[PDB]
Design a binder for this molecule. Structure first.
Ligand code: NAG
Ligand code: NAG
Ligand code: NAG
Ligand code: NAG
Ligand code: NAG
Ligand code: NAG
Ligand code: NAG
Ligand code: NAG
Ligand code: NAG
Ligand code: NAG
Ligand code: D10
Ligand code: D10
Ligand code: D10
Ligand code: D10
Ligand code: D10
Ligand code: OCT
Ligand code: OCT
Ligand code: OCT
Ligand code: OCT
Ligand code: OCT
Ligand code: OCT
Ligand code: OCT
Ligand code: OCT
Ligand code: OCT
Ligand code: OCT
Ligand code: OCT
Ligand code: OCT
Ligand code: OCT
Ligand code: A1IIN
Ligand code: A1IIN
Ligand code: A1IIN
Ligand code: A1IIN
Ligand code: A1IIN
Ligand code: HEX
Ligand code: HEX
Ligand code: HEX
Ligand code: HEX
Ligand code: HEX
Lengths: 335, 335, 335, 335, 335
């Protein structure tokens, strides 16, 4: 097999058509699965099959039929192959169990198919301002390293049909949709122009889970503090312990939520809702202090000279009305 | 040993019977142990022995007896060997201590046995909707990379007897059972058809542990709030602190359970039970508020004009009846 | 040095005495240190020196004295060496700083000493039913990969004296003792019989630490709830808050203990003790509810017609007696 | 391509101009992205493109035009290349997917361009005394390993214009600014002098996030304890539970904050503020004890012989005044 | 450069002076930085420069001046080099970015300088009985692997001046001091005697941080329980809730401290102080139970027949005196 191909009779350190027009190379991609996603480091891991198509007359061999030959990764070190690399990637490797996952198929006229299986991790900027209602977009980029557009031309072989996805791809806490491909030209100041390929998709969260865990407990505790407005003001040993204990219960809820969320160090949409509810509970404690002080002053004044309080009556209306107004404004901005 | 075999006289870059019928290859598998399982990344790790059987007349050597020769991993780089790989795997490697774990045995007539020891990690989709009563199924897949069904034929050498398991295989938090093997054909649009092999097993949890840790504390606290229905309504400084403190105790239990469970971001069966019990505790606090307000109004009305309350009597019956009805419906759906 | 030994004149791909009796190989082991132990994955890491002894007449060289030659790891790739591997191991590697840790010493008559330094991680099944009083046993296994008992014979060179241990070996949370060696034969259905070597040791915990952290706080809280049996029954605002707060304190202790212990998902000995104490605290709360209800009924009955309660007197005796009986049964079973 | 260049006719183990003046080498750097930063281990990870420029007459080839040739990483092992390394680095590696990310361009007159893509992790000393208002500075260093200033001269090719940064570089919890380059000479006692290059940048935090999470809850609880100064002193069952519960609430806040912050084991600016507020809450509990004791003594004295207390009046003024004074001093020192 | 040195004319598999006296080798060490320290696994990571000095007449080359030649890591595989390795090390590696960090300098008369940059992790036994006042000592060991003292002699080239340290070496939570070097002979039963080198240093903690976080909160809570001794005994709804809540507050502090400290599973100095304070709080709760019971009995006895209690008076003196005595004994033992 190494004698039909003129391996030793040709210099394979130079691209086909050296000194002439650029050689076109086609790319096909099949996505196998998505492994994991990190919200702190802002990256994702993908596994895929990568295929290349090009023609090289130096690899032609005589044959009485159209039967193509198949080779392994050992022949790759001798023949010339493209050097595509993934831009903005953090780490990547090629599987080698039980051997290198590389195949080569050579047509009698010199057409070559080159395929390999590779896992790549790529960075992706994310914005958590609208958490947990945020929507994230990611992209993967493929580009030639050493050859500019004047020497190598890169394109999708079959347009938008060149991308295939496994039917079983899924994520534990995200929903994946809208796979499509695009192309663009990249420029480097000290090297020149390059062709670049893109693979795009979108991610979404499960809204209903976060509503039950975070928004639901907060609302109940706020409504629970409104009970004290209906208890008799003369029961000092009852009104005071109820108010302070509700603040303690709210504090533990906020602390627990922060520990479960990722260590994102800036204000998010969920943080605004929780701390506003904390202020409402705090204001209810000061409300009884005014009632107690005024009642004591009035009783002492009558003794020196010798029914529901007005504050309680209005608090029963103002407090529920203010909280509903806050919800309408909050949900109108954050959809 | 390298001269009895015609290593230099044959081209080993081509499969035996090139240009003719497909060469059949048999596979035997022995499972050694299961290392770990991840519920967040949805993958498992397995260690096993992999063996191949095929015939190659080019490796025949003259011998006066049936004594077969044994070689090492150094000879593998010269002779032709199958290229089986594990589909949907994330990472894998071959052990090399103190040397490569590869053996070769060649019969005088050219029959070859090839064995190696390899550890492989494979993905597995899991559903946690019925946690902690869920049951999970996993599979491992073996397939040829470069050779289609027209060139290489893959099958189990001895049918269902080709799979062996160690007697000491176990998991810390799962029960393993139902090992069996199956086969199926896989199709690739741009390459063709391939034979694929499967190894299947099932996993189960320990039910009684989760009942004690999660379901048991929740039931006791709900029954504890029903005590307030039997205390005298005139003891305002006693009824109110009891109600609010029970809500605080329930909140800490729910927070602790979430931290221990894996970060699965959707509603599970256990979450439904815990939050329904929280509502029952919340409703008991509002029940006393109605009793206290009505009692105060009645006393003031009598003074202006100049025994167990009905709500308490019915609450002693309705609340226990409602909770039992919930349990019957809940346990009938989730088995 | 490469010319006194007939490296190029002999075929080193075959074991000495090919076609004849099995070649005996001796093994010496010196344990350097134990690195770590994992209770969730059930494995341990060990570092050791491994030495081999065998005779090969093909490596003899003429010498006027008994001065043996010393070589490095480069000569290993040429001469034949044993292929011992560690069974049931998860991962292992050979150190290479600043170079490969391999030595070779060849006697004039052909005796060869082969030594290397290797770190190996091996699995070990553990049972935590009797935690924290459990005792664990571990073993390490060494076996030849490719050569059966008919071709290679493996044995300890000096019996039980072949195992040496460093004087400074220790673990942070375990006690190591009882190092000894044993041998056994292993059988493989498709390959044959093999000789196997074993290294055994035992591990124990520090009992007194767990008693102070877990058992000590639980006992104090149970005894603390018995105080309410001596307080006047007329102090309703005192008896009720004391009972409910003790339940809250007990709940936080149980939650904290679970977080510190490893994620072992089945019932252990410690879990039984903690939850039984929780029931004792729960029963004390219901005890006062019966006293309060009966007192209220009696007072109302006397009014309609126109001293320590018996329950409190017996509770002072029954509750302390029941808890002591539980301790005697619990400690008699779990030693 | 390997015959136009006199690879076999020259000794490439010696630098160009051996025995003569030092060869000047230029460096260009383009920063791609920052991956992560660790506050416990005090290091950061950076990915960048590194380029070298030098002239070597031994690589000249005849050509009728100015068309330069392009090669791959295979030619690097034959020709002489600079040996730049990153000082104070912990770990680094060169990407190799799908092949080595190395390019070579050779001009007809012998000018050589050498480029590679590398990820490097470097240490950086940090001071957390002024947390969370601290500002950190980092640097990256490049130096030749084996060749001193007498043999190799290292400099920026285009001065301060040699550094380029990606437009999308960002960090999750830090702000990056002030990229600039500097140079300095380094001296080694046993080897000599070396040229060193520097890349500098500055990092800042998000101030407003930490104020809401830490400073905001602490202030509210302190103001909440001042309420007890306005409640009637005769309500013993109300004043005492309010005071002790506030201490409990403050303790949980401090514990939660420590768990979220990195394990920095020395006093920081934030720790001072939290513990001073704890003392203010503690002092309020002792204040009521003095009032209660004095009131009891006065009442007993009057009985034996047969209005707001002064302490409460002053506490309403002294306590708010003292806390405001603390804030002015605290914020004047820590800006 | 490969022809002035007689690489092919000499057998470099044997040490210089084979069959004669031992060859002396000198070592110089410069410490660059300390990366991290682990208190659970008991190991530390260090990065350093290692240099060797020896003479080999086989590498002499003719020269008209004293100009020494410089080489790279490629020549190392041909010439003979020492095989120093780090004893008791867990893992180590040599940096290779952008190339191997190895240099060679050969004098005309055959003197050779060999330098390399390596990162090594070594074990270190630690004792935490006196935490957080403990002091730890660490050591690093260098030894020849294959050559005994009869063939290779190892020594510091310049005595105690051979060790250099970077001015910027620091740790986040430890203080490093007292760098010095020592030497000792090591014996192996089956191999012989070896020379060993040592590098020693000492580590200390920041005392004041742990006092504020652990000792300070514990003392305040104990003093807080002494307040109840000054409140009127007739206020049953005040004395009882104060006592039980203090126990709850103390329990949360102890749980939080354990989570922050490393998982060291034996009794430490800090644990003794915390649990003794817990007993003091527990005893105060039982003290009021005796007062309440005796008061009730006396009142009932007077009714049947028809002022500060003594226990409270003594408790005001005995309790403060006992705690001060404990501190004097505790701090006298643990310095
Ligand atoms: C489509 C095509 O190129 N077919 C070729 C044909 O020219 C040749 O004669 C035959 C061999 O049998 O098959 C092949
Ligand atoms: C079963 C089989 O093929 N046996 C062969 C036999 O033909 C041969 O004569 C003998 C050598 O002694 O053993 C072998
Ligand atoms: C114990 C043994 O085999 N010793 C041999 C001896 O025969 C030989 O004559 C001498 C060389 O001087 O030493 C060696
Ligand atoms: C700027 C420069 O050096 N240009 C050279 C020129 O001398 C030569 O004649 C031409 C080839 O066509 O291009 C190239
Ligand atoms: C100190 C020493 O050995 N120096 C030698 C000297 O003998 C020689 O003549 C000169 C070459 O110019 O320098 C070198
Ligand atoms: C591929 O299909 C997607 C579908 O959204 C479309 O947006 C995109 O433009 C298509 N690409 C090409 C190259 O036609
Ligand atoms: C192997 O045995 C299992 C037992 O469950 C059976 O389901 C399966 O069909 C068998 N496979 C073959 C190939 O007979
Ligand atoms: C080695 O000594 C141990 C000591 O416990 C003993 O049990 C074991 O049998 C001995 N082994 C041999 C091979 O004598
Ligand atoms: C590069 O620009 C920065 C801008 O801050 C300046 O400080 C620095 O000195 C400049 N360097 C040189 C070499 O001019
Ligand atoms: C090196 O100096 C240290 C300083 O503490 C001293 O203890 C040690 O003995 C010295 N070593 C030698 C070899 O002189
Ligand atoms: C008390 C909770 C009130 C919630 C009001 C929600 C209004 C949503 C409008 C879009
Ligand atoms: C108060 C707990 C009642 C539990 C009822 C369980 C019924 C199970 C029916 C299958
Ligand atoms: C209240 C604690 C009683 C403990 C009794 C222990 C008995 C141990 C018998 C072996
Ligand atoms: C009660 C909070 C008072 C805060 C005062 C802040 C003063 C800032 C001066 C720079
Ligand atoms: C209430 C705290 C008393 C502390 C006494 C410390 C004495 C230290 C003597 C060395
Ligand atoms: C499944 C319960 C959702 C509750 C949402 C409450 C939003 C205010
Ligand atoms: C802390 C509450 C003070 C209330 C004062 C009311 C004066 C009208
Ligand atoms: C927040 C409630 C204020 C009510 C004021 C009533 C004045 C008469
Ligand atoms: C081992 C106790 C199990 C309790 C189950 C309770 C289910 C309602
Ligand atoms: C918050 C409880 C209000 C109860 C009102 C009862 C009216 C019948
Ligand atoms: C949830 C209990 C309701 C009881 C209503 C009784 C009306 C007389
Ligand atoms: C929940 C406690 C009820 C007590 C009833 C007692 C009847 C004898
Ligand atoms: C658990 C204590 C029961 C006491 C019953 C006394 C009946 C007179
Ligand atoms: C966004 C609220 C900031 C509050 C700062 C308080 C500083 C005393
Ligand atoms: C613990 C508080 C004691 C208060 C004593 C007051 C003496 C003037
Ligand atoms: C901290 C308040 C002290 C007030 C003292 C008043 C003395 C008359
Ligand atoms: C649990 C406290 C009992 C107190 C009894 C006192 C007898 C003198
Ligand atoms: C721990 C205080 C004991 C006081 C005893 C007093 C006896 C008269
Ligand atoms: N094709 C990417 C690239 C990097 C570089 O330095 N020149 O080109
Ligand atoms: N046999 C698997 C496979 C991948 C590919 O691209 N062609 O075949
Ligand atoms: N010696 C172990 C082994 C594995 C195998 O397949 N045959 O032998
Ligand atoms: N150029 C760095 C270095 C290290 C050394 O030992 N000599 O030089
Ligand atoms: N120099 C260390 C060593 C190990 C061994 O087995 N012989 O020597
Ligand atoms: C926050 C309510 C205060 C009311 C004072 C009249
Ligand atoms: C939730 C019970 C309310 C009863 C009102 C009559
Ligand atoms: C659990 C004790 C109940 C007693 C009822 C008489
Ligand atoms: C801390 C305030 C004490 C006041 C005593 C008169
Ligand atoms: C712990 C104090 C008990 C006192 C009994 C007289």
């Amino acid at each position: 097999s190494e004698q039909l191909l003129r391996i030793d009779d040709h210099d394979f350190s130079m691209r086909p058509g050296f000194g002439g027009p650029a050689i076109p190379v086609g790319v096909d991609v099949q996505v196998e699965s998505l492994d994991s996603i990190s919200e702190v480091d802002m990256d994702f891991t993908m596994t895929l099959y990568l295929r290349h198509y090009w023609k090289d007359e130096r690899l032609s061999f005589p044959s009485t039929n159209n039967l193509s030959m198949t080779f392994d990764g050992r022949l790759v070190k001798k023949i010339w192959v493209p050097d595509m690399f993934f831009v903005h990637s953090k780490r990547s490797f090629i599987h080698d169990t039980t051997t290198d996952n590389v195949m080569l198929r050579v047509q009698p006229d010199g057409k070559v198919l080159y395929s390999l299986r590779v896992t790549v991790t790529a960075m992706c900027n994310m914005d958590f301002s609208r958490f947990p209602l945020d929507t994230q977009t990611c992209s993967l980029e493929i580009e030639s390293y050493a050859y500019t557009e004047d020497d190598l031309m890169l394109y999708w072989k079959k347009g938008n049909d060149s991308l295939k996805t496994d039917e079983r791809i899924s994520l534990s806490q995200f929903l994946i949709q809208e796979f499509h491909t695009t192309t663009k030209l990249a420029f480097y100041s000290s090297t020149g122009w390059y062709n670049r390929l893109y693979i795009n998709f979108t991610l979404r969260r499960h809204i209903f889970f976060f509503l039950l865990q975070t928004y639901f407990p907060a609302t109940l505790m706020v409504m629970l503090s409104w009970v004290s407005f209906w208890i008799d003001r003369r029961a000092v040993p009852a009104r005071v312990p109820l108010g302070i204990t509700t603040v303690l219960t709210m504090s533990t809820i906020i602390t627990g939520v922060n520990a479960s969320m990722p260590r994102v160090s800036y204000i998010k949409a969920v943080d605004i809702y929780l701390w506003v509810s904390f202020v409402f509970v705090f204001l209810s404690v000061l409300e009884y202090a005014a009632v107690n002080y005024l009642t004591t002053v009035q009783e002492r004044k009558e003794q020196k000279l010798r029914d529901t309080h007005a504050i309680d009556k209005y608090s029963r209306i103002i407090f529920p009305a203010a909280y509903i107004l806050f919800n309408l404004i909050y949900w109108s901005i954050f959809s």
